[PDB]
Structures are given as structure tokens and as C-alpha cells.
């Protein structure tokens, strides 16, 4: 009988039957239905009658079982007395020669904090005063303590009965087996006795002595219990810069992340931390101790650095461990992050050296070039390293492989003015075999800026200019680029001037030069030719032309703040980006009142009628996410009764199977068809059910992408900013205004709120409230705001859309 | 009696350089145990062959691995043990950063907070001294 | 009490047999055991996993969870050790875990629970000790 709540009639029958097995099974079936929480008092006389005196342990044990989980509730066969049918003949049970029945009886009897059993539990310590097992003596210290807990904090429970009444706790210390139920409030002499016992311990018992009294002067003295306290005590005597090298903490710690890569990744972190405490700049974070595994002697054999190499990773162990490991290389050794990121990047970025680090997918290659290159932009020393490695990247000599390479290096030159003169000659080489945009773009920029340095350019450019591949974006990049630097410093059959001619043709003009350009018609609609066409005031010469622009870098460009940079090593970053970091007539009148922060729905129940409505009961219901914190409890609604009855309200619950409308309120009365009527007290909305939750800009952005929010409305009374009406109203449809999606200035400055919720509707809810408050001569519609809304199938989107207008209720009875 | 157990050991002068069951190469000076270096794996001291300028270690292999003994550290610390704190300071220009702070801490443990203050690179160790 | 309940669960969505040492967790016992042990106590194949602010210690046996629950704790070794001793005692009564056979020996298991953990404090048990009681 797993859980069957109607079966009590059969149990009575089964409980006495003249067959002992049946009786045991019955009583067992009662236990299992109560434990789940089901019907049990009908049976009581039957249950109690067979078992009572006997020394036959199994039925007695079963009855003994049922007296610690419901004795108080059941009363057919027990009623209320001092020597109840729980203990009257269980004084026999306590005083049987078999330890088990006595012991069991003692154990339940003393366990209860019952006051209708207080006297019978007190000399119940007799059953276990003699200690036939470790179990008997432990059973005794726990039972005396449980007696002490049960209203006997004074002389009824404190001395000895004949050996224990609160003194097993003392005795246990010096006896062969220990266990101290003495944790609080008990004899001082036993506490003292436990200390002595630390030495003459029994190990289970030591965990009991130890919860009470901890800290040792020793190293130990033995056993897991003492050992477990000991690592706590050690952390005290050296708190300083974490544990560093984990103590006896290490054993539990592995299981704490049994799923399976995460342990190594964590372990790797600690091992890296431990090596050294470095400068602790941007991603140079290694704490713990400065010297404890050093770094870097030149006589150390086979050195520290061997372990450091693991941390430099491509994936060399698996991805979770990889992400931890790349950060960890950066963390022990660099200048900041820059130094060790360049080494690390050199390995990752595409080459002709190894083909286990090159790939023909263009974005990844490109990104890897940008990561290597960002280190230079960060720190100078890296410029010198980067440029020759970049030329190796080029040497791959696939159209695309060159292409990616050329694209970053060209950015580097914008930063690094006439420093990378050397690269230009390498960069031209792979520009001729071509099937893509990227190669043309980049090459034309290097060869263009670099012209003073070289003289090749008609020849290199011209094979490509009459070759094909994909050429949209090529136009833009060649347009600003081709002439640049020194007015007449090249010549192969086209000097720098031919280049300016070319540069202009490629931009949007027409001219025979480099055997004509591939295309002329520019990239995306805004860019066009014209700016540059106007430009080249002084023909490709460092002055105030293309050259200027080329040998200068747009805004601030420093660090790895992503200003001509990309922020570490490209593969590690994907993982970091991913991390969102999300945090019968009846009359009612009613108002909601709050006194001393108690929120209640006031209801007055009125019988305007002369007719009888007796049988009157009042209930507030649990609909779904609405709940009663206590229904109105008066038996009112009688002939010409006016009553004030208070129903307390909650807003947060779990969905019930009954209707999901406004608030259900139920009054009952006389009638047999409609004994229960549902009638209303004032408004509560569907919107309550939504649950508020919040987003950060990353979670908002991810969800924006994840599912559409095209749906918009413009809501009146969003004249005001985010903070005022809009927040308060948004709150009531369990929403909250978080992070921005705005871009403010002297022409821009709609207020933008990123909203989130996680509705109990199987959807989230998100929105952006844009408040069109004029920051221009031509506003949208002046003050008002357009709320762009969604939910996960946009079923709550709509709630956001209208619950940001207005919202107010009041009455004054 | 020395803290780190001696799995195997060797005498270089009256100083005992030994391996430990922690994989630590330590040296005994003064009845104090200092760690000269950390061994990454389990290693045994074959002997010290002046020719190679090395201590020859062997793993499980009947082959050679070599650790040169860090004499400058050892001499700084040995001098400290003898209570020749000044003498150990002469060694200090050839004790690097964190090692000067450590050797300083050795000097200090033996006694004389001030001489330890001059050698300690780290300002914090100076500040406390 | 430190130990709220000691409970044998079926991840059928119910507490098959369970023990409330002193009247506190009656119906409460079934809801906790029913939700949490279904997800492996929300574990990942880790003996300690804590969910809804209640420490669940467990061991899977078939579609069943033998579960210890605490919301307070005195020592690391101890919580496992009562569960462990319980796991010696449970196949003597029910021949592994299995809902029907667990159900039939509600009395056996329940009695062991009272004996093993008394007023939430982890006493010790053994298969021979168990015998005197069910005799």
C-alpha cells in the first residue's frame, strides 16, 4: 500500500484476524498511509488491543513506531490520560529481559515532547540504564537529553535515575563507547568529562564530543572526526592569502564537481595561483604566496615552465579546461596579459609553419590575426614581434589566407605609422591569386599606404585589377587607400601619380591605369567615391590627404579595450561573450487596507435579505498564483447581518486547478444547489501571475536575437522618463526597468530601458521602453513613448504594451 | 632534527643537500632545513661531479639529468646560520628579487631584522622589519 | 533535530516510506522527496547536492533514491555514515530498493529509521541489532 488514502475499513478487518502476520501487515499499512499523510484514527481500538503487554517484539515495535509520528492525533482507542495506551503496559515493555523491546520503548517514549506522557518517559530511562550494546548506552544519553528537552530543564531530569537521568553523557566519556547528547544546556561536569574523553575516544562518539567542544592544542590525537575539525583549526593559524596550498580540504573538494572536466579546470586554477603572486595587472591575476614554487631559476631542473606550457592551449586539453588554461597562462606570466598573449597567439594564428593552426575558414583566421596584432597596439615591444609573424601568416598563399592577414595588418599600420614600411613587399606577393574581396582590400591598403618604401606598385596591383574574384567592399577600401605617401617615389610602369589616377578610378571615376580596375561602383550605399575624389589635395602625400588618414588612427587606440584591439586570444573570448552573467444571495463590499504592514482585503458581507442564509461560511480561494494567507473566518451572512470579515492576501503561489480570473471569494449559506456561491470583491489582474526577473544588457541582447520584438505600440503617458509612471506600472505587470539600449547626445537621447521578466505563463517577457522626449527639432510625436515589446511567443508582450499607460484604483466606503 | 624527510642525501661540504619525499631538494644548515630547489618528479642524487658543474640526478632511468647547485643561495643562508649576517649580505647583489626577501627572512629567523631590511627587495618586508 | 527526516524515495514522484522522528514533516516529507529525488536529487552523480535550501544526501538504486535530508549539519563524515549504515540495513529488509517491496516493508524500514537516527541525531545500527526489534 504505496499510498492509498481510502482503505481504513479493510485495515480494521486485517488488524485482528487471529493471524499475527495479518495484524503486523495491517499496522504496517497504517504507518505507510500516515507517513505519506492520510487517514488513520478509525482503527485505533483494534490496533491497540492485540499488542499491548507482550514481549513479542515485532508487533510491539510496530506499535512503538506509530507512537512518534501521530500519537497525539489518534484518540478512538487511546483517548487522553497520563498512562495512555501508548504507555501503561509498555512499562512491561520497558521492563522485559529482551533489550530490544525495552530499548525501543525507551526510545520512542522519551522522544516525544508530549506532556501526556511526561511521567511515563521519565523512569523509561530504566530500559537502557543497563547497556547491553553501544546502541543501548547511546540510546540512553539521547533519551535523557530528550527528557530534559521535554519540560524537565530543572530537577525531573538532571541527576541519575539509578545510573542516568542526564548522567549517561558523563558516563559515556569514560565508557567504552561515546556519544554526547549534551550539545546544549546540560551538565557542566559532562562537558568537562568530554574533554578528558578526547584522549580516550570512541570515534562516532568523538564527532558527538567534538560538535560540543572543538580546538585542540595538539596536532591531532587520531580518528576522522578530530581530523575534520583540525583543518578548520589550521586555517585559523594561517588565514593569510587564502589557504594557498589546500589542507585537508582537498578530499571533499574533488566530489564537489564530479561532472568531470570542471574539477581539472579548477585544479589548474589553484595550481597556477600557487606558482607565484605576480604583479596582478590585467589578467596577470595570480594570488596566493609569492614564493612557494617560485618562478624561473636557470639552475632549476627540469624547471617550473614545463607546467606553465600546459596552460598555453589551443585546446590541448578539453574546452572547459582550455578556457581556464588560456587565462591561467596569461595570469602567471605576462607584462599584463600582452606578453604571454602574443606567444600564445603566435601558436594559434595562421601560418605556413604548421597546418594545425591554419584553417581555410576566413573569419577565424582573421580574428586570430587581429588578436595577435592587438598585442602590439597594447604594448610596443609586440609591434616588432607581430610584423614578421604576420608576414609568415601571409605565406600560406591561398587567396583567403593572404586576405585575412592583410586586413588586420593594414589597421596596425594606421596605429603604427611608418614603422611597418618593411612589410609592404611581403604583402603584395599573395594578391595575385585571388577569389575574394578581403585580399584585394587589405593588399591595396598596404601597398597603397606604403608607396614611398616600394616602387613595384603598377605591376602588383595590375594583375589583380584585371583579375576577378568578389569585389564589393574592395572599392571602399581601395578608394580611401591607393595613392598615399610621398608624391613620386614609385615607378614600375606607373609611378605614385598613376596610383592616384587609379585610386580615383577604382573609387568611382574612370581612367586607363593598372589595366583598369576590377570594379568602380563602391560597397554599401552610404560610402560612395566622392570624399576621397575631392581629397588627394596634395597627390598621395603626407599632408592633409588619404596619407594623413592612413598614417593616423581613428580616435584613441591603446590597450585591449577593443580600440584597434580584440581583447585577448580569440578562442578564449567566445566563451567569455557567451557568459551572459544573468542575475444563496450574498452582498460584498470591499477595499484593501494595510495596517502595520499587514496586507488584507477587507470585505464586508451583507445580507440585505430577510431570508435565511444560515449555514454561512466564508472562504477566500487560491486561484493560481493568487493565494489566501488566511480566509475570512466568521460564520456571518445571517438574516440582516452586516459584518466586516478580513481576508488576508498573497500574490505569489503555485497554480491551482480552479479558475484563473480576478479574485474568487466564496460565501456559503443555505441552498442545496448553489450551497457555494462565488461573488466578487474588487479587481485583481491576470498580470499578477507573471513573475519578475531581470536582465543585464548581455541577457537582453541575447534574448533580442533569440526571438523577435518587432511588435511595438506607442503608449500614451510615457511622456515621462523610465523612472516615474512607467517603472511603477511595469512593476505591477511584474516587470522591471533595467539596463539601457541608448546612444544619447544632442540629437539622440530617447530614454531606453531593457526589461525582463520570466512569466509563469511558459514565456519570459521583455521590452524596451523608448521615450520620445524631444532632443530634436522634429520629434517622433513629441513626448510619449513607443514601447517595443515581446515575450517568448509575445503573449505577454501585449501586457507590457498597455500596462505602462496608466493604472490606479481607490474607493472610500 | 630536520623537518623534511631525507629520501636520499649527499654531503656538499658539511652542508647536507638531500632529496625529500616531497620532491624537495633541501639543504641542512644549522639544524635548519632550507629548500634549495624543487624537484618536479622523483629524483635521486647520483653524485656531484665538479667537471660538469653539476649534481647528477637520475629518475627511474639509468640516464642523467643535471641540477647545478644554487651556491649563491646556499652560501647566503650558510653564512646566516653561522651568525655571519654581513657576510651573507655580500652575497646579496647576486640573489634576485623575491630571493632577497626570502634570504632576508632566513637572516631574520636566525636574527637581525635590520640587515634583513637592507637585502629585502620587497618594500613590505622592509616596512615590517 | 539536525536531521529533518530520513527517507526512502521512489522517483515515481512520491516518498515511498519515510520517517518523521517527531511530528513535523508528515505531508511535507512526500513533496520534498517526490520533486527532488526525481532529478537525482538535482545531483550530477554527487552524494551531496542541496536544493530549495535543504541538503539532500543520496544514493541511486534503480528508479529509487535512498535519501537523507538535513538542513543543518554538525559534521561532514556523519551525514554519510548514517546513510551508509542505512544502506546496509535496507537490502536485509527489501532486497535492494524497489517501490512495491519498499512499500511492503514500511514497518521494517521505518523502525530502522527511528533506531538509526533518534530525534535527528545519528545513532548507529547493524543488521543483527535490527533483529531484536522485529523479533
Swiss-Prot record, chain A:
Post-translational modification: Proteolytically cleaved between Ser-513 and Ser-514 by CAPN8.
Pfam annotation, one family: Adaptin_N
HEAT repeats: 81-116, 117-153, 225-261, 262-299, 301-338, 381-418
UniProt subcellular location: Cytoplasm; Golgi apparatus membrane; Cytoplasmic vesicle, COPI-coated vesicle membrane; Cell membrane
Keyword Protein transport annotated: yes
Domain of life: Eukaryota
Keyword Membrane in annotation: yes
GO molecular-function terms, A-Z: structural molecule activity
Tissue: Predominantly expressed in the upper one-third of the oxyntic mucosa and in most regions of the pyloric mucosa. Ubiquitously expressed including platelet, liver, heart, spleen, lung and kidney.
Membrane topology: Peripheral membrane protein
An example Gene Ontology biological process: intra-Golgi vesicle-mediated transport
Keywords: Acetylation, Cell membrane, Cytoplasm, Cytoplasmic vesicle, ER-Golgi transport, Golgi apparatus, Membrane, Protein transport, Repeat, Transport
InterPro entries: ARM-like, ARM-type_fold, Clathrin/coatomer_adapt-like_N, Coatomer_bsu_C, COPB1, COPB1_appendage_platform_dom
UniProt modified residues of type N6-acetyllysine: 479
Gene Ontology CC: COPI vesicle coat; COPI-coated vesicle; cytosol; endoplasmic reticulum-Golgi intermediate compartment; Golgi apparatus; Golgi membrane; plasma membrane
Task performed by this protein: The coatomer is a cytosolic protein complex that binds to dilysine motifs and reversibly associates with Golgi non-clathrin-coated vesicles, which further mediate biosynthetic protein transport from the ER, via the Golgi up to the trans Golgi network. Coatomer complex is required for budding from Golgi membranes, and is essential for the retrograde Golgi-to-ER transport of dilysine-tagged proteins.
General remark: Brefeldin A induces dissociation from the Golgi of the beta-COP and presumably the other coatomer subunits.
PANTHER family noted in UniProt: COATOMER SUBUNIT BETA (PTHR10635:SF0)
Record's protein name: Coatomer subunit beta
Source taxonomy: Eukaryota, Metazoa, Chordata, Craniata, Vertebrata
Curated annotation (Swiss-Prot), chain B:
Deletion consequences: The knockout of the gene results in early embryonic lethality with no viable embryos recovered at 12.5 dpc.
Location relative to the cell: Cytoplasm, Cytosol; Golgi apparatus membrane; Cytoplasmic vesicle, COPI-coated vesicle membrane
Domain of life: Eukaryota
List of residues that carry N6-acetyllysine: 109
Purpose of the protein: The coatomer is a cytosolic protein complex that binds to dilysine motifs and reversibly associates with Golgi non-clathrin-coated vesicles, which further mediate biosynthetic protein transport from the ER, via the Golgi up to the trans Golgi network. Coatomer complex is required for budding from Golgi membranes, and is essential for the retrograde Golgi-to-ER transport of dilysine-tagged proteins.
Protein family according to the UniProt entry: Belongs to the WD repeat COPB2 family.
Assembly and binders: Oligomeric complex that consists of at least the alpha, beta, beta', gamma, delta, epsilon and zeta subunits. Probably interacts with PEX11A. Interacts with SCYL1. Interacts with JAGN1.
Name of the molecule in the record: Coatomer subunit beta'
Curated annotation (Swiss-Prot), chain C:
Localization per Swiss-Prot or TrEMBL: Cytoplasm; Golgi apparatus membrane; Cytoplasmic vesicle, COPI-coated vesicle membrane
Top-rank taxon, per record: Eukaryota
The protein's assembly and partners: Oligomeric complex that consists of at least the alpha, beta, beta', gamma, delta, epsilon and zeta subunits.
Similarity remark: Belongs to the adaptor complexes medium subunit family. Delta-COP subfamily.
Role this protein plays: The coatomer is a cytosolic protein complex that binds to dilysine motifs and reversibly associates with Golgi non-clathrin-coated vesicles, which further mediate biosynthetic protein transport from the ER, via the Golgi up to the trans Golgi network. Coatomer complex is required for budding from Golgi membranes, and is essential for the retrograde Golgi-to-ER transport of dilysine-tagged proteins.
Protein name per UniProt: Coatomer subunit delta
Organism: Mus musculus
Amino acid at each position: 500500500m504505496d499510498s492509498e488514502p481510502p482503505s481504513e475499513i479493510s485495515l480494521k478487518n486485517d488488524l485482528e484476524k487471529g493471524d499475527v502476520k495479518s495484524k503486523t501487515e495491517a499496522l504496517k499499512k497504517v504507518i505507510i498511509m500516515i507517513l505519506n499523510g492520510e487517514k488513520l484514527p478509525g482503527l485505533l481500538m483494534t490496533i491497540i488491543r492485540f499488542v499491548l503487554p507482550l514481549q513479542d517484539h515485532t508487533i510491539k515495535k510496530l506499535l512503538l513506531v506509530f507512537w512518534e509520528i501521530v500519537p497525539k492525533t489518534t484518540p478512538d482507542g487511546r483517548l487522553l490520560h497520563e498512562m495512555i495506551l501508548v504507555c501503561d503496559a509498555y512499562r512491561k515493555d520497558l521492563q522485559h529481559p529482551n533489550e530490544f523491546i525495552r530499548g525501543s520503548t525507551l526510545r520512542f517514549l522519551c522522544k516525544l515532547k508530549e506532556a501526556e506522557l511526561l511521567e511515563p518517559l521519565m523512569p523509561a530511562i530504566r530500559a537502557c540504564l543497563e547497556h547491553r550494546h553501544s546502541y543501548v548506552r547511546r540510546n540512553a544519553v539521547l533519551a535523557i537529553y530528550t527528557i530534559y528537552r521535554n519540560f524537565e530543564h530543572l530537577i525531573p531530569d538532571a541527576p541519575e535515575l539509578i545510573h542516568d537521568f542526564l548522567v549517561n553523557e558523563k558516563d559515556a566519556s569514560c565508557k567504552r563507547n561515546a556519544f554526547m547528547m549534551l550539545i546544549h544546556a546540560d551538565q557542566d561536569r559532562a562537558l568537562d568529562y568530554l574533554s578528558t574523553c578526547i584522549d580516550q575516544v570512541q570515534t562516532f562518539g568523538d564527532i558527538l564530543q567534538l560538535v560540543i567542544v572543538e580546538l585542540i592544542y595538539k596536532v591531532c590525537h587520531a580518528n576522522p572526526s578530530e581530523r575534520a575539525r583540525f583543518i578548520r583549526c589550521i586555517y585559523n593559524l594561517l588565514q593569510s592569502s587564502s589557504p594557498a596550498v589546500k589542507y585537508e580540504a582537498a578530499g571533499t573538494l574533488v566530489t564537489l564537481s564530479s561532472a568531470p572536466t570542471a574539477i581539472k579546470a579548477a585544479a589548474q586554477c589553484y595550481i597556477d595561483l600557487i606558482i607565484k603572486e605576480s604583479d596582478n595587472n590585467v589578467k596577470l591575476i595570480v594570488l596566493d604566496r609569492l614564493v612557494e614554487l617560485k618562478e624561473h631559476p636557470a639552475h632549476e631542473r627540469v624547471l617550473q615552465d614545463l607546467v606553465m606550457d600546459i596552460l598555453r592551449v589551443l585546446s590541448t586539453p578539453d574546452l572547459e579546461v582550455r578556457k581556464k588554461t588560456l587565462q591561467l597562462a596569461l595570469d602567471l606570466v605576462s607584462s599584463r596579459n600582452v606578453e604571454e598573449l602574443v606567444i600564445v597567439l603566435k601558436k594559434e594564428v595562421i601560418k605556413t609553419n604548421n597546418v594545425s593552426e591554419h584553417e581555410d575558414t576566413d573569419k577565424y583566421r582573421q580574428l586570430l590575426v587581429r588578436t595577435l596584432h592587438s598585442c602590439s597596439v597594447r604594448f610596443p615591444d609586440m609591434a616588432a614581434n607581430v610584423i614578421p609573424v604576420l608576414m609568415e601568416f601571409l605565406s600560406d598563399s591561398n587567396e583567403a589566407a593572404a586576405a585575412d592577414v592583410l586586413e588586420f595588418v593594414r589597421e596596425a599600420i594606421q596605429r603604427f605609422d611608418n614603422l611597418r614600411m618593411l612589410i609592404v613587399e611581403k604583402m603584395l606577393e599573395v594578391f595575385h591569386a585571388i577569389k575574394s574581396v578581403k585580399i584585394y582590400r587589405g593588399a591595396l591598403w598596404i601597398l597603397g599606404e606604403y608607396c614611398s618604401t616600394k616602387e613595384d606598385i603598377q605591376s602588383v596591383m595590375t594583375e589583380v585589377r584585371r583579375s576577378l574574384g568578389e569585389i564589393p567592399i574592395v572599392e571602399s577600401e581601395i578608394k580611401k587607400e591607393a595613392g598615399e605617401l610621398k608624391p613620386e617615389e614609385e615607378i614600375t610602369v606607373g609611378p605614385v601619380q598613376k596610383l592616384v589616377t587609379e585610386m580615383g578610378t577604382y573609387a568611382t571615376q574612370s581612367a586607363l591605369s593598372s589595366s583598369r580596375p576590377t570594379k568602380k561602383e563602391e560597397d554599401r550605399p552610404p560610402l560612395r567615391g566622392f570624399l576621397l575624389d575631392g581629397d588627394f589635395f596634395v597627390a598621395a602625400s603626407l599632408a592633409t590627404t588619404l596619407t594623413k588618414i592612413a598614417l593616423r588612427y581613428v580616435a584613441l587606440v591603446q590597450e585591449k579595450k577593443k580600440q584597434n584591439s580584440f581583447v585577448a586570444e580569440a578562442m578564449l573570448l567566445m566563451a567569455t561573450i557567451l557568459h551572459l552573467g544573468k542575475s444563496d444571495p450574498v452582498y460584498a463590499e470591499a477595499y484593501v487596507h494595510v495596517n502595520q504592514y499587514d496586507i488584507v482585503l477587507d470585505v464586508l458581507v451583507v445580507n440585505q435579505t430577510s431570508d435565511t442564509l444560515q449555514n454561512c461560511t466564508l472562504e477566500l480561494a487560491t486561484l493560481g498564483d493568487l493565494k489566501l494567507v488566511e480566509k475570512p473566518s466568521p460564520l456571518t451572512l445571517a438574516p440582516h447581518d452586516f459584518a466586516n470579515i478580513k481576508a488576508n492576501v498573497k500574490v505569489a503561489s503555485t497554480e491551482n486547478g480552479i479558475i484563473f480570473g480576478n479574485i474568487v471569494y466564496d460565501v456559503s449559506g443555505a441552498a442545496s444547489d448553489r450551497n457555494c456561491v462565488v461573488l466578487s470583491d474588487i479587481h485583481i489582474d491576470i498580470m499578477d501571475y507573471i513573475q519578475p526577473a531581470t536582465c543585464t544588457d548581455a541577457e537582453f541582447r541575447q534574448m533580442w536575437a533569440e526571438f523577435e520584438w518587432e511588435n511595438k505600440v506607442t503608449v500614451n503617458t510615457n511622456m515621462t522618463d523610465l523612472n516615474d509612471y512607467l517603472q511603477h506600472i511595469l512593476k505591477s505587470t511584474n516587470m522591471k526597468c533595467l539596463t539601457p539600449e541608448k546612444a544619447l547626445s544632442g540629437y539622440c537621447g530617447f530614454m531606453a530601458a531593457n526589461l525582463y521578466a520570466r512569466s509563469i505563463f511558459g514565456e519570459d517577457a521583455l521590452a524596451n521602453v523608448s521615450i520620445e522626449k524631444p532632443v530634436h527639432q522634429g520629434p517622433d510625436a513629441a513626448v510619449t513613448g513607443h514601447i517595443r515589446i515581446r515575450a517568448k511567443s509575445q503573449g505577454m508582450a501585449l501586457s507590457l504594451g498597455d500596462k505602462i499607460n496608466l493604472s490606479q484604483k481607490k474607493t472610500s466606503l | 632534527e630536520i623537518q623534511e624527510i631525507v629520501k636520499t642525501g649527499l654531503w656538499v661540504g658539511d652542508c647536507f643537500i638531500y632529496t625529500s619525499s616531497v620532491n624537495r631538494l633541501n639543504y641542512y644548515v644549522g639544524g635548519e632545513i632550507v629548500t634549495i630547489a624543487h624537484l618536479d618528479r622523483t629524483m635521486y642524487l647520483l653524485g656531484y661531479i665538479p667537471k660538469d658543474n653539476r649534481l647528477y640526478l637520475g629518475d627511474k632511468e639509468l640516464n642523467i639529468v643535471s641540477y647545478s647547485l644554487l651556491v649563491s643561495v646556499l652560501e647566503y643562508q650558510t653564512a646566516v646560520m653561522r651568525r655571519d649576517f654581513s657576510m651573507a649580505d655580500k652575497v646579496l647583489p647576486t640573489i634576485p628579487k623575491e630571493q632577497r626577501t626570502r634570504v632576508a627572512h632566513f637572516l631574520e629567523k636566525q636574527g637581525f631584522k635590520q640587515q634583513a631590511l637592507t637585502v629585502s627587495t620587497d618594500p613590505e618586508h622592509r616596512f615590517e622589519l | 533535530m539536525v536531521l529533518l527526516a530520513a527517507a526512502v524515495c521512489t522517483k515515481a514522484g512520491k516518498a515511498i516510506v519515510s520517517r518523521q522522528f517527531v511530528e513535523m514533516t508528515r505531508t511535507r516529507i512526500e513533496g520534498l522527496l517526490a520533486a527532488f529525488p526525481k532529478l537525482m536529487n538535482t545531483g550530477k552523480q554527487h552524494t551531496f547536492v542541496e536544493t530549495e535550501s535543504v541538503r539532500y544526501v543520496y544514493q541511486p538504486m534503480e528508479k529509487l533514491y535512498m535519501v537523507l535530508i538535513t538542513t543543518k549539519n554538525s559534521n561532514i563524515l556523519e551525514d554519510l555514515e548514517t546513510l551508509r549504515l542505512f544502506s546496509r540495513v535496507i537490502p536485509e529488509y527489501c532486497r535492494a530498493l524497489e517501490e512495491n517491496e519498499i512499500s511492503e516493508h514500511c514497518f521494517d524500514l521505518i523502525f530502522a529509521f527511528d533506531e538509526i537516527v533518534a530525534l535527528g541525531y545519528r545513532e548507529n545500527v547493524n543488521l543483527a541489532q535490527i533483529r531484536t526489534f522485529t523479533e
